[PDB]
Amino acid sequence: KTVIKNETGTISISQLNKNVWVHTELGSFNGEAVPSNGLVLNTSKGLVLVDSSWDDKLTKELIEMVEKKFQKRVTDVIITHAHADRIGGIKTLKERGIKAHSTALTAELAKKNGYEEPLGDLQTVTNLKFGNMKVETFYPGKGHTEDNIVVWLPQYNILVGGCLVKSTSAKDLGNVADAYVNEWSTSIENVLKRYRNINAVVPGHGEVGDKGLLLHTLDLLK
């Protein structure tokens, strides 16, 4: 049930479990309100985000909300690809001394698109631990973008799909200009192969689902 919104209503967080919430922000795309998801991980060494938000204003507001609520600092963010939706708050992170993890390719792409660079520290498979919280990052191949990664929480069997994974409500692939529609199916299969028992799947946009969201993505690719 538990859902907390900000003043203006533009930001929301909703609990999945004792230490794991989804954050969602309404941003401005072409040309309506469009929601974007990530994760807030409440660990004993601080707050870790899987993705920040659309722009600096929303990222600052997000950080401020979870800092106030959980009474600890945001220490780390995992940036799941280099579109503005994911990388847009990078300047806020760097200036606050928040570590912005990404693959090298995501870092390269950010800079090519004129953003400040995340760390480029993540390999194809990276295993991180913050306090007691275990976090795996996985590059499954190209799909929604060249660089898109997923994030797995092995203690909860929770998969952050990012924009690689479409919600039920999504009835097409979205913007495919940066996409690789042949390789996207294989990428999704690589996820299904690596993570055989999944409790919950967080799509880049839309409502939390399960493994069925990955199967939905495959169908939308046919």
Ligand SMILES: O=C(O)[C@H]1CS[C@@H]2CS[C@@H](CS)N12
């Ligand atoms: O993931 C997507 O398909 C689209 C629809 S909403 C958001 C803004 S365009 C792209 C950047 S992640 N993304």
Ligand SMILES: [K+]
């Ligand atoms: K454990």
Ligand SMILES: [Zn+2]
């Ligand atoms: Zn994207």
Ligand SMILES: [Zn+2]
């Ligand atoms: Zn997206």
